[PDB]
């Protein structure tokens, strides 16, 4: 609702808004530039009637006097819903697959909540990945954190796509889903997953968050 036209300083990627009130830490903002360009940002420090904010898209070409800052009042959230299965989103969660945006059941902070040490359950059932080395010499278990160490040029791109298609549980008494998160990758590498998931039909049981390398580093962290 409130639009703040009082920008005091613009120092590097950070701005200084004065004569403000009701601003909280890590509050998401929205900067309306003098040329109609809209850039969203986050609060890093707030004191008295002042507020220090960091702009995601950057600080280039922002005039302090003819620009306004909109404090949204909510931290970084995500519109969760069952309709996310079979859809592709960006790092910020906005639609990317040229599809109709879906209404969410609720909004949740991306920081998540810590699982209670007594309420947590031990991993009990194995996952069929289709790879011999992952299912025999090693073994994947439901709830395990099993990473894949790779290097530049290695085909870790095709392996992650192979597991997402061949991942299933026997017998399939309950539903299985895959959340794929691309973090700061190239376009040809991102276009590889999108074409492979839709070709094989693995997209129908998966949610994809794709963040490019040219995207802001803030989106790369929130992905």
């Amino acid at each position: 609702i409130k639009e703040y036209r009082t920008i005091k300083e613009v120092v590097g990627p950070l701005m200084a808004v004065e004569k403000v009130s009701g601003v909280k830490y890590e509050e998401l903002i929205e900067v309306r530039m003098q040329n109609g360009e809209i850039r969203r940002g986050q609060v890093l420090e707030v004191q008295e009637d002042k507020a220090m904010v960091q702009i995601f898209e950057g600080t280039s070409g922002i005039n302090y006097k003819n620009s306004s800052v909109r404090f949204l009042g909510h931290p970084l959230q995500l519109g969760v819903s069952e309709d996310m299965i079979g859809r592709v989103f960006d790092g910020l969660g906005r639609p990317k697959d040229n599809g109709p945006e879906i209404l969410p059941e609720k909004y949740l902070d991306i920081n998540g909540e810590v699982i209670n040490p007594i309420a947590r359950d031990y991993p009990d059932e194995f996952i069929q990945t289709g790879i011999s080395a992952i299912d025999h010499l090693n073994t994947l278990v439901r709830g395990q954190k099993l990473p894949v160490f790779s290097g530049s040029g290695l085909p870790h791109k095709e392996l992650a796509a192979q597991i997402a298609r061949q991942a299933t549980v026997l017998d399939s008494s309950d539903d299985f889903a895959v959340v794929f998160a691309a973090i700061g990758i190239t376009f040809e590498e991102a276009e590889f997953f999108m074409e492979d998931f839709r070709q094989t039909g693995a997209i129908d049981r998966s949610v994809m968050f794709m963040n490019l390398a040219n995207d802001p580093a803030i989106e790369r962290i929130a992905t």
């Binding site: 300083e9 613009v10 590097g12 003098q34 600080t59 070409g61 302090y64």
Partner: peptide, 26 residues
């Protein structure tokens, strides 16, 4: 420099040597 914005090019001094605005406060 109230009308100028960040990353704008400038002509500094009588010579007008080329310069770029990095930080701007008021």
């Amino acid at each position: 420099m109230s009308e100028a914005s960040i990353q704008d090019m400038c002509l500094v001094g009588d010579l007008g040597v080329i310069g770029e605005i990095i930080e701007m406060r008021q």
